[PDB]
Amino acid sequence: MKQLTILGSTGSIGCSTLDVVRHNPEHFRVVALVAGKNVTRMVEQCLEFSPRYAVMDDEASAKLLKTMLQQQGSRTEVLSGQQAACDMAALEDVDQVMAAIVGAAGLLPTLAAIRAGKTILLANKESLVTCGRLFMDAVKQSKAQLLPVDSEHNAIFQSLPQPIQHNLGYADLEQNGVVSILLTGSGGPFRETPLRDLATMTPDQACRHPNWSMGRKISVDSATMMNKGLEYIEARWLFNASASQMEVLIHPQSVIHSMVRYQDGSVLAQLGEPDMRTPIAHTMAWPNRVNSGVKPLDFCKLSALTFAAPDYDRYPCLKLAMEAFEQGQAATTALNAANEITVAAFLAQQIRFTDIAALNLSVLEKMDMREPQCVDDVLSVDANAREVARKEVMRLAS
Amino acid sequence: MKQLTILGSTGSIGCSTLDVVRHNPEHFRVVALVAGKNVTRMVEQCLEFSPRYAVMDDEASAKLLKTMLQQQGSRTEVLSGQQAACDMAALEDVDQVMAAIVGAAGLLPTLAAIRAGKTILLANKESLVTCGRLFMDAVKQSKAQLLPVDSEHNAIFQSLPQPIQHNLGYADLEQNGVVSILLTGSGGPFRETPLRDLATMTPDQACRHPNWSMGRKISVDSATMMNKGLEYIEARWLFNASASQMEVLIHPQSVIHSMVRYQDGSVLAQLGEPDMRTPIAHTMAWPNRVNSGVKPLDFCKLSALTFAAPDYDRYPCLKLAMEAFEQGQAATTALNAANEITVAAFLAQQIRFTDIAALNLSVLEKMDMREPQCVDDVLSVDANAREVARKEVMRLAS
Ligand SMILES: NC(=O)C1=CN([C@@H]2O[C@H](COP(=O)(O)OP(=O)(O)OC[C@H]3O[C@@H](n4cnc5c(N)ncnc54)[C@H](OP(=O)(O)O)[C@@H]3O)[C@@H](O)[C@H]2O)C=CC1
Ligand SMILES: NC(=O)C1=CN([C@@H]2O[C@H](COP(=O)(O)OP(=O)(O)OC[C@H]3O[C@@H](n4cnc5c(N)ncnc54)[C@H](OP(=O)(O)O)[C@@H]3O)[C@@H](O)[C@H]2O)C=CC1
Ligand SMILES: CC(=O)[C@@H](O)[C@H](O)COP(=O)(O)O
Ligand SMILES: CC(=O)[C@@H](O)[C@H](O)COP(=O)(O)O
């Protein structure tokens, strides 16, 4: 029996995680739930799973949650704020922490779980992207184990040998017969959209992913392929891969979730339904398996599986992420921050869909900070880039 | 340094095996080569790899080989016959034996390697099919290591967890999170051929496999899908799988080589170029990897990947194989024997392509013999089936 804290319980990943728990009450128990502002969902989750604690980051949301749960006779203690989220991630009683807060806001609570030596079920890719080597070193220095939840990285993990799996981030790919890591793939909802129509796409259009039901931020990132850029960076840290050991491949059906090339010509892959309960359950049970609620993939009802080279002209954000990573951590931290601001602006109908990539570039051109030496420096670059991004958004205020 | 005996060196698998040796001369050396009657090829292989011994089954071929080797200055010594092949498989200095003789003729030399405790690179599926549990038990009692070379079984092996890999044939699939084994798939050269045009198909037409360049016997088996039937039986022994843990899937492109379903919905697969050097190299180097000479799979050049359920009515041999396995080992041994006789008669233009399945069923219906309790019994059932099959072929003589 393993006890769990879920960071970001009310969102897409959080709810999928709770469904895996629902299917396996003998194996998993929720001790703490952490979220932002969705009180309605958090009340529902607390009444079902009777967590010891529930945390809302937003102070006013926490007040409402405390009152509502008290009237319902809940035993759950309600806390509030960022520090309480960190406290939950570090509960001495907890074995696993689902890191599923969106954006760099998840970094401090995720780092707290790492310092406490927990098993980190890493969905929140922005935390690793923005923190980089400092993140990976903290996992090694403490007793922590990273298990990749993100679909592609989970697929790659499943398709790697045990010496790599058991020394994630530091083992040598070539010594284990790996030639490269093949990161797929979808292209998003606008893959075939005429280029001239991109400027007038709405938030609802951008968030209708053809294959995955996800949160709004990552759905927009999938439409620009900034998501694939962030995942490229994530893969390089997780699997200790160089630029020459990474391939990006478009696969519009999202059945093959990613692959690994070996020296003898073999390519190992993970396939399945586009359902995050599968990778979540992989990480929660590893090295064993559990029922996730996902049924067997029916190969007789599939679309034909196709592949293609990335259309870099169409998706400037992909190349931007790759070049930021080349430049260094300051540029990468700045780019992630800029993208959080521009995506949020687009969702709030302040800028156009095509302004995301342009404003992201504009922020990078205006920033030239030194490489972070500690987590405080990562946060300074992040904060600075957010401010630059807010000013660029306001310049396009209609 | 690993020293090899290759059973069936001059054939399709044998030549691919020697190309892996050619690419890795610091890792592999050939001690003995065993073949049938292809003297010309054996001469070339002896001159290049300088084996201590060469064995031809054909006594006239051994005579010719000796003369040619002595004329051309080779120090390779020549023997002949089945017993000599068994002796080559059990040499002290031999580490690995490539079992790549076609048909049940490979059984005794393969069993000799097993009893000597060698690493068995098993390509010769008919030996396991015809001997079944007695084969798997011999491996267990002698502490030989079985590594599947057959493309599909190698792909499944690569897609299974370590506890199954390290206890092949005796570990529990369910305890290791496996739901089923997915066996693909091609359908053969007559997949789209109208049923009424099969009667006039020539040996060359049946042997023209759309995806794999192989020996003539297995190529005809792929045309009737008897090969997939034999592979179904092979898979159930190797991976300790029940009928409900097996799935057969048509996959015309032969890019996905086979797959494994897990409890959480995950499907693991191996893909690659349709080139046997890949799986051969995988077994030769295991648990490490080597360059096999096979180029990396170009996903952008691939045809769309498709899947379909088997058409058992078009392919009565596939159904007959699955039925014979449920009936027991006597029926399975008899069917394999019958099919060796009918395929050979078809290749020699004694019977029609459509006579293969018809005569195979006829032989099984006339066969009533006891379950083999030992290898001698397997040989008696096999010999009896061949008699019945030969009689049936002779009745169709023009
Ligand atoms: N959804 C998916 O299929 C995949 C998601 N991911 C990653 O997982 C992470 C979560 O994404 P997703 O679930 O889609 O996003 P959602 O918007 O659906 O959920 C985000 C969660 O984070 C919470 N949250 C936001 N800010 C804070 C804060 N500062 N403190 C505590 N909690 C906070 C939200 O609370 P609330 O809603 O109550 O305000 C919500 O529970 C992202 O990093 C994403 O990249 C990766 C692969 C796939
Ligand atoms: N080719 C492929 O892609 C695959 C093959 N296999 C299996 O591997 C085995 C070999 O197949 P393949 O290479 O295609 O067949 P081939 O016809 O190309 O080769 C058969 C080999 O066996 C030799 N041989 C035949 N009879 C005897 C005998 N009685 N004693 C010693 N050697 C003998 C042949 O000698 P010679 O030619 O000199 O007469 C030849 O070297 C088969 O069991 C097949 O099912 C499995 C998966 C794939
Ligand atoms: C489900 C998941 O892990 C997403 O990160 C996925 O990458 C989205 O699809 P795209 O490939 O279109 O970004
Ligand atoms: C390469 C190999 O292992 C063959 O056995 C393969 O199975 C032949 O193709 P079919 O799938 O058409 O039988």
PDB file of N, CA, C and O in Angstrom, chain B residues 230-257:
ATOM      1  N   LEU B 230       2.487 -22.158 -37.220  1.00  0.00           N
ATOM      2  CA  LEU B 230       3.671 -22.699 -36.564  1.00  0.00           C
ATOM      3  C   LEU B 230       4.214 -21.687 -35.556  1.00  0.00           C
ATOM      4  O   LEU B 230       4.637 -22.056 -34.459  1.00  0.00           O
ATOM      5  N   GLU B 231       4.152 -20.406 -35.909  1.00  0.00           N
ATOM      6  CA  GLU B 231       4.603 -19.331 -35.030  1.00  0.00           C
ATOM      7  C   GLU B 231       3.705 -19.166 -33.797  1.00  0.00           C
ATOM      8  O   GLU B 231       4.177 -18.784 -32.736  1.00  0.00           O
ATOM      9  N   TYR B 232       2.423 -19.468 -33.951  1.00  0.00           N
ATOM     10  CA  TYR B 232       1.464 -19.443 -32.852  1.00  0.00           C
ATOM     11  C   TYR B 232       1.851 -20.499 -31.823  1.00  0.00           C
ATOM     12  O   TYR B 232       1.932 -20.208 -30.633  1.00  0.00           O
ATOM     13  N   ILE B 233       2.111 -21.711 -32.301  1.00  0.00           N
ATOM     14  CA  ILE B 233       2.536 -22.817 -31.445  1.00  0.00           C
ATOM     15  C   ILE B 233       3.878 -22.508 -30.776  1.00  0.00           C
ATOM     16  O   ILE B 233       4.046 -22.690 -29.571  1.00  0.00           O
ATOM     17  N   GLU B 234       4.832 -22.036 -31.566  1.00  0.00           N
ATOM     18  CA  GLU B 234       6.147 -21.658 -31.052  1.00  0.00           C
ATOM     19  C   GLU B 234       6.025 -20.634 -29.913  1.00  0.00           C
ATOM     20  O   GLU B 234       6.697 -20.755 -28.887  1.00  0.00           O
ATOM     21  N   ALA B 235       5.151 -19.644 -30.099  1.00  0.00           N
ATOM     22  CA  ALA B 235       4.978 -18.555 -29.133  1.00  0.00           C
ATOM     23  C   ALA B 235       4.396 -19.046 -27.809  1.00  0.00           C
ATOM     24  O   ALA B 235       4.813 -18.606 -26.740  1.00  0.00           O
ATOM     25  N   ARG B 236       3.444 -19.965 -27.879  1.00  0.00           N
ATOM     26  CA  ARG B 236       2.812 -20.477 -26.669  1.00  0.00           C
ATOM     27  C   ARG B 236       3.788 -21.277 -25.811  1.00  0.00           C
ATOM     28  O   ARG B 236       3.745 -21.186 -24.587  1.00  0.00           O
ATOM     29  N   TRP B 237       4.693 -22.024 -26.445  1.00  0.00           N
ATOM     30  CA  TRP B 237       5.754 -22.727 -25.706  1.00  0.00           C
ATOM     31  C   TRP B 237       6.780 -21.763 -25.106  1.00  0.00           C
ATOM     32  O   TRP B 237       7.118 -21.862 -23.924  1.00  0.00           O
ATOM     33  N   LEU B 238       7.271 -20.830 -25.923  1.00  0.00           N
ATOM     34  CA  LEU B 238       8.352 -19.931 -25.510  1.00  0.00           C
ATOM     35  C   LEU B 238       7.939 -18.987 -24.392  1.00  0.00           C
ATOM     36  O   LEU B 238       8.736 -18.697 -23.501  1.00  0.00           O
ATOM     37  N   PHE B 239       6.702 -18.507 -24.446  1.00  0.00           N
ATOM     38  CA  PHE B 239       6.239 -17.457 -23.543  1.00  0.00           C
ATOM     39  C   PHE B 239       5.193 -17.950 -22.551  1.00  0.00           C
ATOM     40  O   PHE B 239       4.650 -17.148 -21.781  1.00  0.00           O
ATOM     41  N   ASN B 240       4.943 -19.265 -22.552  1.00  0.00           N
ATOM     42  CA  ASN B 240       4.036 -19.899 -21.595  1.00  0.00           C
ATOM     43  C   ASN B 240       2.642 -19.265 -21.653  1.00  0.00           C
ATOM     44  O   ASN B 240       2.060 -18.877 -20.637  1.00  0.00           O
ATOM     45  N   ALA B 241       2.125 -19.154 -22.872  1.00  0.00           N
ATOM     46  CA  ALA B 241       0.879 -18.456 -23.147  1.00  0.00           C
ATOM     47  C   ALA B 241      -0.232 -19.440 -23.467  1.00  0.00           C
ATOM     48  O   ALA B 241      -0.022 -20.414 -24.181  1.00  0.00           O
ATOM     49  N   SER B 242      -1.416 -19.164 -22.930  1.00  0.00           N
ATOM     50  CA  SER B 242      -2.618 -19.923 -23.227  1.00  0.00           C
ATOM     51  C   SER B 242      -3.222 -19.415 -24.534  1.00  0.00           C
ATOM     52  O   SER B 242      -2.736 -18.444 -25.122  1.00  0.00           O
ATOM     53  N   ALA B 243      -4.292 -20.059 -24.985  1.00  0.00           N
ATOM     54  CA  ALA B 243      -5.013 -19.588 -26.160  1.00  0.00           C
ATOM     55  C   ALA B 243      -5.572 -18.180 -25.944  1.00  0.00           C
ATOM     56  O   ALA B 243      -5.528 -17.351 -26.851  1.00  0.00           O
ATOM     57  N   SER B 244      -6.074 -17.902 -24.740  1.00  0.00           N
ATOM     58  CA  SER B 244      -6.689 -16.606 -24.442  1.00  0.00           C
ATOM     59  C   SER B 244      -5.653 -15.488 -24.265  1.00  0.00           C
ATOM     60  O   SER B 244      -6.012 -14.306 -24.231  1.00  0.00           O
ATOM     61  N   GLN B 245      -4.379 -15.862 -24.145  1.00  0.00           N
ATOM     62  CA  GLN B 245      -3.282 -14.900 -24.069  1.00  0.00           C
ATOM     63  C   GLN B 245      -2.575 -14.700 -25.419  1.00  0.00           C
ATOM     64  O   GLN B 245      -1.537 -14.041 -25.482  1.00  0.00           O
ATOM     65  N   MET B 246      -3.127 -15.275 -26.485  1.00  0.00           N
ATOM     66  CA  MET B 246      -2.595 -15.091 -27.836  1.00  0.00           C
ATOM     67  C   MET B 246      -3.605 -14.358 -28.708  1.00  0.00           C
ATOM     68  O   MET B 246      -4.809 -14.594 -28.614  1.00  0.00           O
ATOM     69  N   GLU B 247      -3.095 -13.468 -29.550  1.00  0.00           N
ATOM     70  CA  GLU B 247      -3.880 -12.808 -30.584  1.00  0.00           C
ATOM     71  C   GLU B 247      -3.072 -12.877 -31.866  1.00  0.00           C
ATOM     72  O   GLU B 247      -1.858 -12.684 -31.840  1.00  0.00           O
ATOM     73  N   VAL B 248      -3.739 -13.187 -32.971  1.00  0.00           N
ATOM     74  CA  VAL B 248      -3.133 -13.128 -34.292  1.00  0.00           C
ATOM     75  C   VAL B 248      -3.726 -11.932 -35.034  1.00  0.00           C
ATOM     76  O   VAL B 248      -4.945 -11.783 -35.102  1.00  0.00           O
ATOM     77  N   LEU B 249      -2.849 -11.088 -35.577  1.00  0.00           N
ATOM     78  CA  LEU B 249      -3.221  -9.830 -36.220  1.00  0.00           C
ATOM     79  C   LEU B 249      -2.556  -9.771 -37.585  1.00  0.00           C
ATOM     80  O   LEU B 249      -1.353  -9.968 -37.682  1.00  0.00           O
ATOM     81  N   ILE B 250      -3.329  -9.503 -38.631  1.00  0.00           N
ATOM     82  CA  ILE B 250      -2.767  -9.243 -39.955  1.00  0.00           C
ATOM     83  C   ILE B 250      -2.212  -7.815 -40.012  1.00  0.00           C
ATOM     84  O   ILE B 250      -2.892  -6.872 -39.634  1.00  0.00           O
ATOM     85  N   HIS B 251      -0.975  -7.681 -40.482  1.00  0.00           N
ATOM     86  CA  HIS B 251      -0.273  -6.414 -40.608  1.00  0.00           C
ATOM     87  C   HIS B 251       0.542  -6.481 -41.921  1.00  0.00           C
ATOM     88  O   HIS B 251       1.682  -6.928 -41.912  1.00  0.00           O
ATOM     89  N   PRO B 252      -0.054  -6.071 -43.045  1.00  0.00           N
ATOM     90  CA  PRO B 252       0.545  -6.287 -44.378  1.00  0.00           C
ATOM     91  C   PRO B 252       1.956  -5.729 -44.618  1.00  0.00           C
ATOM     92  O   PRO B 252       2.675  -6.248 -45.481  1.00  0.00           O
ATOM     93  N   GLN B 253       2.352  -4.707 -43.868  1.00  0.00           N
ATOM     94  CA  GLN B 253       3.616  -4.018 -44.118  1.00  0.00           C
ATOM     95  C   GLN B 253       4.819  -4.700 -43.458  1.00  0.00           C
ATOM     96  O   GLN B 253       5.948  -4.469 -43.866  1.00  0.00           O
ATOM     97  N   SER B 254       4.571  -5.523 -42.437  1.00  0.00           N
ATOM     98  CA  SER B 254       5.619  -6.215 -41.675  1.00  0.00           C
ATOM     99  C   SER B 254       6.670  -5.267 -41.088  1.00  0.00           C
ATOM    100  O   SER B 254       7.854  -5.580 -41.066  1.00  0.00           O
ATOM    101  N   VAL B 255       6.219  -4.103 -40.625  1.00  0.00           N
ATOM    102  CA  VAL B 255       7.070  -3.127 -39.947  1.00  0.00           C
ATOM    103  C   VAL B 255       7.044  -3.364 -38.437  1.00  0.00           C
ATOM    104  O   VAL B 255       8.096  -3.466 -37.809  1.00  0.00           O
ATOM    105  N   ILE B 256       5.848  -3.440 -37.858  1.00  0.00           N
ATOM    106  CA  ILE B 256       5.692  -3.950 -36.504  1.00  0.00           C
ATOM    107  C   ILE B 256       5.831  -5.464 -36.548  1.00  0.00           C
ATOM    108  O   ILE B 256       5.055  -6.158 -37.208  1.00  0.00           O
ATOM    109  N   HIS B 257       6.813  -5.974 -35.821  1.00  0.00           N
ATOM    110  CA  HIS B 257       7.210  -7.364 -35.942  1.00  0.00           C
ATOM    111  C   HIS B 257       6.464  -8.276 -34.962  1.00  0.00           C
ATOM    112  O   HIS B 257       6.412  -9.486 -35.153  1.00  0.00           O
TER     113      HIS B 257
END
